Amino acid sequence: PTFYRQELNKTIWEVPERYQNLSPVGSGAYGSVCAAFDTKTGLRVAVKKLSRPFQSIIHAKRTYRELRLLKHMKHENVIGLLDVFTPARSLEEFNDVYLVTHLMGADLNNIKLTDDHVQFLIYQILRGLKYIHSADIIHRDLKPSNLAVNEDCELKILDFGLTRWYRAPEIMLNWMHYNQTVDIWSVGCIMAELLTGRTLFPGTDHIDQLKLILRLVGTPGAELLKKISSESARNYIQSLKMNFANVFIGANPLAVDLLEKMLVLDSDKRITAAQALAHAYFAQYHDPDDEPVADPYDQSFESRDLLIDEWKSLTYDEVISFVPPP
Ligand SMILES: O=c1ncn2nc(Sc3ccc(F)cc3F)ccc2c1-c1c(Cl)cccc1Cl
Ligand SMILES: CCCCCCCCO[C@@H]1O[C@H](CO)[C@@H](O)[C@H](O)[C@H]1O
């Protein structure tokens, strides 16, 4: 394919002629994104240029992790790859990676909604999340900026968009043994924000965050306190449930019920994505024959400590072996 090279905000962009009208959209810690017109399909696409993929072992592993993940994601409510490319002709000159996906045009942060909107948006997050969780993946950072949305309200989960507010309390306590329901806590927070037009737990730090959570959900019972190893955490928690019905007064009572089953302190007793999809609140959208699960996903590389050249070679193999969707 014939590549062409141009400069957008001091960043060099070298892409196939397939992609036209490159327009800068923004950036993150892990790269920069342009909007572009895909002449092959006539659709608009988001192109992400990874910034310095192989600067370090951690960058190299992060690059591999992203490419491997997005190659696996094949679902309507989850970001996947239309294309992956590098201007490098060989492994020896391999130093850039570009990822291409279908463009939605907005995130959930740039969007007080009606109840039907909330039903549809949250249903799509949970449908996508069921698929993600079925591959034994935990997102760990669900928040509005990691949810890409259409102008007809279709939603896809992103891995990194353009945080503590939506984090499960056990992550704040640094438990390290997280259940997948950490993502369901995050969904609970987002859902509440959409309904009420305001952040549920706008903590100023990780400590204030727990205070705000405790004010709504109540102090943990005896059964939860005995699971907390940290003497400091236990001393802070004990040195301090609101009627959800009233906190979310005016909302759909089925929306309030679901929210009570998501924002549960005990991660064991939180509703799963698959369980939440069958809640009466989503009766208009729930179709158990169209809520698919994922092919098992090999994350065994995550426990490996490899050199940059090894990560880099493995990333290159995954670029060359990429087969686009139909
Ligand atoms: O609509 C989008 N669709 C996809 N992405 N992807 C990314 S990152 C990315 C990931 C995988 C790709 F193949 C390519 C990538 F760029 C970032 C934003 C984005 C948007 C978007 C836009 Cl264009 C504007 C405002 C807010 C958002 Cl969430
Ligand atoms: C400040 C509010 C108190 C937070 C209590 C969080 C309880 C989280 O729940 C706990 O999650 C752990 C990690 O997945 C599991 O090991 C436990 O079984 C579970 O009870």
Specify the CATH number for the domain of residue 266: 1.10.510.10
Is position 305 within any domain?
A: no
Count of domains forming the chain: 2
Looking up tokens 């600067």 gives 55
Is position 157 within any domain?
A: yes
How many Å apart are CA 290 and CA 292, to the nearest integer?
6
Which CATH number is 26's domain given? 3.30.200.20
How many Å apart are CA 44 and CA 32, to the nearest integer?
17
Task: State which residues form the domain around 88.
Answer: 13-105
**Pocket probe mutation, ligand 2, options 172, 180, 224, 228, max atoms within 8 Å of Cβ:** 224
What is the number of other CB atoms lying within 10 angstroms of the CB of residue 275?
Answer: 13
Looking at the structure, do residues 128 and 71 belong to the same domain, yes or no? no
Q: Under a CB-based contact definition with an 8 Å cutoff, are residues 80 and 68 in contact? A: no
* Residue 268 in contact with ligand 2 by CB distance below 6 A: yes
Q: Where are the alpha helices (DSSP H) in 24-114?
A: 57-72
How many Å apart are CA 301 and CA 68, to the nearest integer?
10
Is position 325 within any domain?
A: no
**CB-based burial label for 302 (10 Å; 0-12, 13-18, 19+):** exposed
Q: Under a CB-based contact definition with an 8 Å cutoff, are residues 109 and 145 in contact? A: yes
How many Å apart are CA 119 and CA 199, to the nearest integer?
18
Determination technique for this entry: X-ray
Nearest protein Cα to ligand 2, atom 14: 178
Handedness of CA 56, 58, 60, 63 (dihedral sign): negative
Is position 186 within any domain?
A: yes
Looking at the structure, do residues 133 and 233 belong to the same domain, yes or no? yes
Looking at the structure, do residues 65 and 204 belong to the same domain, yes or no? no
Cite the beta strand spans of the chain per DSSP E. 3-8, 11-16, 19-28, 31-38, 43-50, 83-85, 98-102, 147-149, 155-157
Residue 146 CA, closest ligand 1 atom number? 28
Inter-CA distances, 312 with 62, 93, 96, 202, 307, Å: 11, 11, 10, 40, 9
Looking at the structure, do residues 277 and 143 belong to the same domain, yes or no? yes
Query: Cβ neighbours of residue 158 under 8 Å, at least 6 residues apart?
Result: 79, 107, 145, 146, 147, 148
Looking at the structure, do residues 193 and 162 belong to the same domain, yes or no? yes
Looking at the structure, do residues 206 and 270 belong to the same domain, yes or no? yes
Looking at the structure, do residues 74 and 219 belong to the same domain, yes or no? no
Q: Under a CB-based contact definition with an 8 Å cutoff, are residues 35 and 29 in contact? A: no
Q: Where are the alpha helices (DSSP H) in 10-157?
A: 57-72, 115-134
Is position 149 within any domain?
A: yes
How many Å apart are CA 129 and CA 123, to the nearest integer?
10
The tokens describing 62, both together, are 């992060």
How many Å apart are CA 95 and CA 50, to the nearest integer?
10
Instruction: Resolution in Å, one decimal, please.
Output: 2.4
**Pocket probe mutation, ligand 1, options 71, 100, 162, max atoms within 8 Å of Cβ:** 162
Does the annotation count 141 as an active-site position?
no
Q: What angle do CA 204, 208, 211 make, to 5 degrees?
A: 145
